[PDB]
Symmetry: D2
Subunit: 279 residues, 4 copies
């Protein structure tokens, strides 16, 4: 089934132990946890202890945020790429099937250099992941205030699909965030026509701003705004997506309420959104 | 977690509806269902109805038995290969992450022909599956009575690992069956030293026959025989396998009891085996 | 080692037989011929005859100008791609080891859409040429007047090198033109430090214009201008390039003297420049 | 089109300079040279000098005998593999477009272990040669006395063709030997129906023995035996092969006449056979 997934931005919580406790307590099964959190624990207590935290609580790791920097110098990049398989296997064991990263909507660097190197490194990343049966989902970023550097890059799903050709790796798709689908002015049918395997991971959230205005860093809880979230989910559902939907609510200032009431409220809100979209 | 998975041979049951009912009723979540069963339903009632049968019962499809014949004529093979992606996507939606097939331990055909064509077609199969994040697990077959054709093929995990090189596809591993691990005279450490992603799917079962004697077609319920099943599981567990373990108990004659008592008894037996192996 | 190659730009001759007669009579071995003249003579006479023509005259085809349009619609590009292997085979028989294309130094199309699709299409051309032991030499274009479309593309070897990363094909190299090397303000060692198989084909020509002034369609014969041509061929030589070096002198207005004079004179100043290069 | 190539088996000459002098003096363009003689002369004199030697004499290296052992230990095979690209580059400069190896028609090693590893290793050799526009010509061996090891391997073109499927590399073809074509009881059209790029290199020789009798180390000069050689070259010709045709006459006992006589005589009977072939 499509299911609600807890995300760190929803709750005011930095302790790994307590974050996982909050997920269980508020009735989630899927948790999004950044890899540095898991790595900090693996180092202190070994990989098996980390798996025990998830399995003692009935939790499944939703995803692995790519743990390298696609813009490093070549020697650092290659080094971090060598380390990716073991980091990916640890996350597979905790339930993740996907590794994700976002793409900048604009940049100051010369296109042929920036785009070509980035195509090749993403390909290398995707290739290290083929033995593990994992896909790369690339988040296209839609808000307009990120477009004012010198040259355009990816600003939409249509853009992202042409960028797949540069990469040329069979296991590369999309992380689809409502915020970016909204800000890019896309339609339910843009998402419905994706092959299922190309919907790698999904974010949900909201805004009362018009597409041109909405700020990437100033988001609302799913359902406190104007984004058509039932058509968003429905489209993903008709695509054939059947996994976690995380409420990534990036914000600059304290969100309203407590970590706990927020977690429970959005779980409830998303189960209802998800059942309306199935319809 | 490693979990028990129901297999069709355990129960005396040919109706899809009732087989799925038996899985729920006997407390399983993972079910092994051959694809022809699911296809027969998809044809009568459309793909969505098939997904509804699993989701209404809390069930997850464990695996997809490769739905083509690796030994057909080229035009039929190519045709069935074209149809594999949509069949694989339907099974992904029901929860399967793996597509499997077994290899003959001996054959009458000339080696260079038989082995080369088979390497190339498995590669083609594995390649169609890279976009879906799915792995191919190849079952090595250990019993000795299948070795008396003209030429040897794969009879063990060590053999299978050399055959991976012929295939040259990054998402190809093993379906590990205790029956074949036993009959091939392998050790817990053979399985522990596998990379996790190479343990694609797992079968469990038993026998009172010595390795040289055991018949492929005349198996016993997990725990009614002499195969060291705790070291079998433990090895798979230390490899890093965290999925379904199916009791494939091929038999020529009625197994002892009812379908229901068998299903419940082996679930119980495997949860206990699995907890001893974790230890 | 390196040898002079007749380019059509040198001669008035627009008939294949007469062109080939002139190459013979002016001393050349290596002839560059536009592909259409060869498709055309293979239509009237047949494959056997075009081969007969060359060999009778001691002649070897230097190259094949990529006979398709890399910017066309997808269905038309695919058709021409499908035709490419037989055309490349006919050119292999005549001695062509290379297939070439130039890149636009600027474009109005959005960078992500343009760069990705063009990388993927060159990749497809390259894959089709792998069974034939043939390489793609991509021509980077340097002149400054060509750089005033909306977005920048390839303008230098350094740029071309990063573009090879997008393409991601083992058999893709450079067509190095003296006009472009000079107008890109490159150095002899930029050439020297290339692996020899990355130097696919070479053009040579001159200008009295500064690097920033020199015009694409208004070139001169080599040894009539300001470009250091001896360092040009010494960098190629030390890189390990060994085939034909063609005098591509594009011009809007007639080069004085006859075709027979320029042609014969070019061979001679080419041989001497190539001794000076070679120590 | 096709042209005669001096093979060492023809001449007493065991010194590279003297061998090359003889090819010149006996009329040849295409010379086959064992690689060690070239590694050896590139040690005393240097890369520049071995190139100088050839070009001064109007000579072109036909081929490179694969300078490694495909059956060695893994670490030793990998080292020699790593050395292969520079050795192949030095041979490219001398005009070699091909790299060749023969296959054993039988072996004692288990088929799965032997075939898989050897397919994967030839695949690795082929991948290293893709950036250089070079192909692998694999020599199938036909004589019947070679077929009495424990398991059968490649004995015919038909077999070799299926072996290419295991290897799965776009640049791998055949070394076609008249001795093997005859002793495999093949037909002219078996050759004709090959794509031209699959004909990598060609050996020619004779025997008075029947197909079933003829011995591998006991061959004759071409035009001294019972093999239809004109249909041999017409099938190659119509396949589209255009390079050197080498007289490999392995022998345990001296061929009568001098080296200078056999060498000169071979060129002549080769040219005439090649006219008869060509219609």
């Amino acid at each position: 089934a499509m299911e609600p997934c807890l995300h760190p931005t929803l709750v005011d919580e930095t302790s790994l132990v307590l974050y996982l406790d909050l997920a269980r307590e508020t009735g989630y099964r899927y948790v999004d946890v950044p890899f540095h959190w898991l790595e900090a624990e693996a180092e202190r207590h070994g990989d098996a202890a980390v798996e025990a935290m998830f399995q003692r609580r009935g939790l499944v790791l939703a995803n692995l945020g790519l743990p390298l920097n696609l813009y490093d110098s070549e020697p650092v990049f290659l080094r971090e790429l060598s380390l990716l398989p073991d980091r990916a296997r640890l996350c597979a064991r905790l339930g993740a099937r996907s590794v994700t990263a976002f793409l900048w909507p604009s940049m100051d660097e010369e296109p042929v250099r920036y785009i070509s190197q980035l195509a090749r490194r993403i390909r290398q990343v995707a290739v290290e992941l083929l033995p593990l049966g994992m896909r790369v989902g690339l988040e296209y970023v839609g808000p307009h205030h990120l477009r004012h550097r010198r040259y355009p890059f990816v600003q939409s799903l249509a853009d992202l699909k042409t960028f797949w050709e540069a990469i040329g790796a069979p296991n590369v798709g999309a992380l689809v965030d409502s915020y970016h689908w909204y800000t890019a002015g896309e339609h339910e049918d843009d998402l419905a026509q994706l092959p299922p395997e190309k919907v790698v991971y999904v974010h949900i959230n909201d805004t009362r701003d018009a597409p041109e205005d909405a700020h990437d860093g100033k988001r609302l809880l799913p359902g406190d705004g104007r984004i058509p979230l039932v058509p968003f989910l429905r489209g993903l559902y008709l695509a054939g997506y059947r996994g976690p939907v995380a409420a990534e609510v990036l914000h600059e200032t304290p969100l309203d309420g407590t970590g706990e009431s927020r977690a429970r409220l959005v779980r409830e809100r998303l189960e209802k959104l998800i059942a309306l979209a199935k319809g």
